[PDB]
């Protein structure tokens, strides 16, 4: 059934699974029309489909052309994500196909289930976890590759860079979510923390700086502080 606090650690066994977050699929800017009405302007989006065990991020770019001529676009977005996830599954070798797909929002359940009918043995599951994947567009390299795109397209990255050479996926994923949580809560601050040291650089096939182990513990504590800091400011505590 649903992914929650009880079964956190199933994410790191050897049963292939994918997370799918659809928050960044349909992106808009609101603004005033000349007449003084309100209208929207669509911008490029991205399906976030992540395998938490390996770190592989199957970033499907969603071009603004896909919306052209459509109504109930918030609702179409969910059906378009499902269509694209299904095509990703369909395109993969069978021994690569996920046994579970965990959607981060419950609205995605019926569209994915309908699009996956040809895969009766792949389970579509919700999660009660609050995962911070909407902050994925806060990673400069994803945001850049999405906004530059001139056509639908799929990008590949390791969301863990090379971390799994030194650490396990449980630990990688905790590091990822901490980092994404911070970015969600205070993007400016979080980025400052990541890049203040110009001698630490971001490799070309990577999304995050090449911190050493000790340097990750330092980064890791500064994010924690950042996240606590922002909470008192929000809630006055």
């Amino acid at each position: 059934g649903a992914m929650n606090s009880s079964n956190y650690a199933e994410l790191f066994n050897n049963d292939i699974k994918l997370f799918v977050d659809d928050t960044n699929v349909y992106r808009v800017t609101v603004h005033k029309t000349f007449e003084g009405n309100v209208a929207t302007k669509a911008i490029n989006g991205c399906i976030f489909t992540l395998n938490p065990k390996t770190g592989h991020l199957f970033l499907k770019i969603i071009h603004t052309s896909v919306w052209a001529g459509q109504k109930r676009l918030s609702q179409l977005a969910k059906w378009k994500t499902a269509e694209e996830v299904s095509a990703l599954v369909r395109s993969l070798p069978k021994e690569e196909q996920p046994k579970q797909i965990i959607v981060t929002r419950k609205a995605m359940l019926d569209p994915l289930e309908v699009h996956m009918l040809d895969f009766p043995n792949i389970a579509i599951r919700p999660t009660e976890l609050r995962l911070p994947f909407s902050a994925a567009m806060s990673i400069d390299k994803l945001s850049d590759v999405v906004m530059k795109a001139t056509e639908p397209q799929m990008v590949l990255f390791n969301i863990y860079d090379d971390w799994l050479d030194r650490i396990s996926s449980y630990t990688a994923f905790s590091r990822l979510t901490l980092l994404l949580r911070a970015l969600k809560t205070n993007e400016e601050s979080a980025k400052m923390i990541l890049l203040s040291d110009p001698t630490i650089t971001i490799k070309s096939y990577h999304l995050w700086p090449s911190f050493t182990d000790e340097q990750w513990i330092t980064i890791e504590s500064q994010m924690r502080d950042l996240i606590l800091t922002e909470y008192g400011r929000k809630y006055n505590v």
Partner: protein, 300 residues
């Protein structure tokens, strides 16, 4: 007018005949029901005074033979049976009538209710759902499950309703995932009406027989079918104008006939609020909406 004599009433029992029902005390001299309107299906049903579990019953049409009820004590229940000897039968019915051992099917002349609850119910279609074709009548009861309930265990005893599943390949056309799931006209009109039922009458007939099995027996799977077949119509944007009008009559009488206290189990909050207030057809069931809001306003 036809008759269903009883051999006897050995055990205390509440007897139902269509939407009527009478109490019968153990070894009270009761020997059947007379004045049963020829021309529609009927159902006779039972609930033992001692064990209210397992309501059970026989659907039947007297135009298909001469049927009597005989309690069987090895099996402990009232059994429908056929008399192939017409001469023997009439002879028995007339003696009980002269002795007056029979209650009269209490048909009020103004009342079309049963007609209205069974307009599209055909005995031939019933025996497809309740397969037991060495009998002209069809046994049904509380615990009996459906072929869909078996897919999610004895087959000879299954209710073989038509399977309806909104997340099935049957229901969804490739490339129209979103269209067909939000608007089920394909599934209803091509797959279901044209494909499996052939016409709207056979559809309406199964929907009505499902409703009746839920209400008289608390058969939960017949309840599910019934709602499934409402929801399918209501979740289509394209429904023959004539089917909408008939469905609104059909449901009205189903609503009118339900026991008021039984509302919490035989009516599914979600489906009705959808059908009446979200579905494409929210504005198409004026009589059904009116009676629902005036009689079960809580559920909505």
């Amino acid at each position: 007018m036809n008759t269903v004599p009883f051999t006897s009433a050995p055990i205390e029992v509440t007897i139902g005949i269509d939407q009527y029902s009478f109490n019968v005390k153990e070894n009270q001299p009761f020997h059947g029901i007379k004045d049963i309107p020829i021309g529609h299906v009927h159902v006779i049903h039972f609930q033992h005074a001692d064990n209210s579990s397992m309501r059970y019953g026989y659907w039947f049409d007297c135009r298909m033979g001469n049927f009597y009820i005989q309690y069987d004590p090895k099996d402990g229940l009232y059994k429908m049976m056929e008399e192939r000897d017409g001469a023997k039968f009439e002879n028995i019915v007339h003696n009980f009538k002269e002795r007056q051992m029979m209650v009269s099917y209490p048909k009020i002349d103004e009342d079309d209710t049963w007609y209205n609850l069974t307009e599209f119910v055909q005995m031939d279609k019933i025996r497809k759902i309740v397969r037991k074709d060495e009998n002209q009548f069809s046994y049904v009861d509380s615990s009996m499950t459906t072929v869909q309930e078996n897919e999610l265990s004895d087959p000879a005893h299954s209710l073989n309703y038509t399977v309806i599943n909104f997340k099935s390949r049957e229901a969804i056309r490739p490339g129209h995932e979103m269209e067909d799931f939000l608007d089920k006209s394909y599934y209803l009109n091509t797959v279901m009406l044209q494909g499996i039922f052939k016409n709207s009458s056979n559809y309406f007939g199964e929907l009505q027989f499902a409703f009746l099995n839920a209400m008289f027996f608390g058969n939960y799977g017949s309840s599910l079918q019934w709602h499934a077949m409402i929801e399918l119509i209501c979740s289509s944007a394209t429904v023959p104008k004539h089917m909408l009008d008939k469905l609104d009559e059909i449901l009205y009488y189903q609503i009118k006939t339900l026991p008021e206290q039984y509302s919490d189990i035989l009516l599914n909050e979600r489906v009705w609020n959808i059908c009446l207030y979200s579905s494409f057809q929210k504005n198409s069931l004026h009589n059904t909406e009116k009676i629902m809001e005036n009689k079960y306003p809580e559920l909505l």
